[PDB]
Amino acid sequence: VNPTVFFDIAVDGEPLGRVSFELFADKVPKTAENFRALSTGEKGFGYKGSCFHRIIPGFMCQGGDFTRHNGTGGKSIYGEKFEDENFILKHTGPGILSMANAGPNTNGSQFFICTAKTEWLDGKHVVFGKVKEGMNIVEAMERFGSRNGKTSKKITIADCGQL
Numbered sequence: 001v002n003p004t005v006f007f008d009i010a011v012d013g014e015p016l017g018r019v020s021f022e023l024f025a026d027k028v029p030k031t032a033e034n035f036r037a038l039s040t041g042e043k044g045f046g047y048k049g050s051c052f053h054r055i056i057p058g059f060m061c062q063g064g065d066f067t068r069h070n071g072t073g074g075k076s077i078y079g080e081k082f083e084d085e086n087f088i089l090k091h092t093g094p095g096i097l098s099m100a101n102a103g104p105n106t107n108g109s110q111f112f113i114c115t116a117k118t119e120w121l122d123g124k125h126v127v128f129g130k131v132k133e134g135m136n137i138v139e140a141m142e143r144f145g146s147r148n149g150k151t152s153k154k155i156t157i158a159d160c161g162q163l
Contacts, residue, residue, distance in 0.1 A: 002022050002023055002024060002025050002026060002032075003022075003023050003025060003032070003036050003162055004020055004021065004022055004023070004132060004162065004163040005020065005021050005023065005035070005036055005039040005040075005160065005161065005162050005163065006018055006019065006020045006021075006039075006159075006160060006161060006162075006163050007019045007020075007021075007039075007047070007157045007159075007160045008157070008158045008159040008160065009137055009141060009155065009156070009157065009158065010155075010156045010157075010158040011141075011144065011153050011154070011155055012153045012154050013154075013156075013158075015158065016137060016140060016141070017134055017136070017137035017140065018133070018134050018137065019113075019131060019133070019134035019135075019137050019138055020131070020132045020133040020134055020163060021035075021097055021129045021130065021131055021132060022129055022130055022132045023035055023036055023097075023128060023129040024089060024127075024128055024129055024130075027086070027088050027089060027128075028085045028086060028088070028089070028126060028127075028128045029085075030078075030082070030085050031085045031099060031107065031126050031128040032128050032129065033077070034076050034077050034078065034082070034107075034109070035097075035111065035128065035129065036162065037077045038064075038066075038076075038077065038109055039160045039161060039162065040160075040161050040162050041160075041161075043077050045066065045075075046066065046160070047063075047064060047066055047109075047157050047160050048157060048158075048159060048160050049066070049156065049157065049158075050063060050064065050065065050066035050069065050156065050157050051063065051065075051069055051154060051155060051156045051157075052141065052151065052155040052156075052157075053065055053069060053070050053071050053149075053151070054071060054145075054149035054150075054151075055141060055142060055144060055145025055146075055149060055151050055155065056145055056146075056147065056148075056149050057115070057142045057143070057145045057146075057147075058115060058116055058142075059114075059115060059116055059118070060112040060113060060114050060115055060116075060118065061112060061113045061115065061138065061141055061142065061145070061155075062100060062110065062111070062112040062113075062149075063110070063111065063112075063155075063157070064100070064108075064109040064110040064111045065109070065110050066109060071110065074108040074109035074110045075108050075109055076107060076108050076109055080108065081105065081106045081107060081108055082105070082107050082108075083105040083107070084101075084104060084105050084107065084126050085126055085128075086126070087122065087123045087124075087126065087127075089126075089127035089128070090119070090122045090127060091114055091117060091118040091119055091121045091122055091125070091127060092117060093114070093116070093117045094114055094115050094116060094117075094131075094135065094138075095113070095114065095130050095131035095135055095138070096113070096114040096118075096127055096129075096130055097111060097112075097113060097114075097127065097128055097129035097130060097131070098111065098112055098114065098118075098121065098125045098126065098127045098128070099111055099125055099126045099128065100112055100125070101124075101125060107126065113131065113138055115138065115139070115142055141155055
């Protein structure tokens with residue numbers, strides 16, 4: 001059975017709500033395991049306390065840079081970067097979880113939650129999960145974004161783990 005992980009989201013330190021994700025370990029096991037382990041922190045580092053640094057309404061919410069907090073950092077449990085596992089799954093609509101990258105085979109820890117269908121990312125970003133519960137919380141987060149991605153309040157992962 002595919003693992004489920006949760007983020008508890010806070011806005012300027014005030015609790016907003018919980019989002020849970022199904023990770024498609026049956027189709028992208030290496031990519032799913034990276035996200036799972038970073039969510040539990042079991043390797044000694046991970047997402048707890050990190051922020052969503054880029055939110056564009058009608059597009060996506062981006063996070064996972066837990067070392068520089070602005071899109072220039074992060075690392076995977078396999079090292080600084082790891083390969084594109086496969087592109088079996090596509091960006092079919094809101095709720096899709098996909099890896100951010102800076103070119104072929106440069107996955108780290110950064111990810112984005114799609115809030116729209118983003119078909120032009122198919123075959124370039126590895127899809128590895130989907131929102132299971134709390135899409136309404138993602139929609140609420142989206143309202144703190146802007147056209148250039150800067151957030152009007154600090155959106156943080158106050159807690160996270162495996163359900």
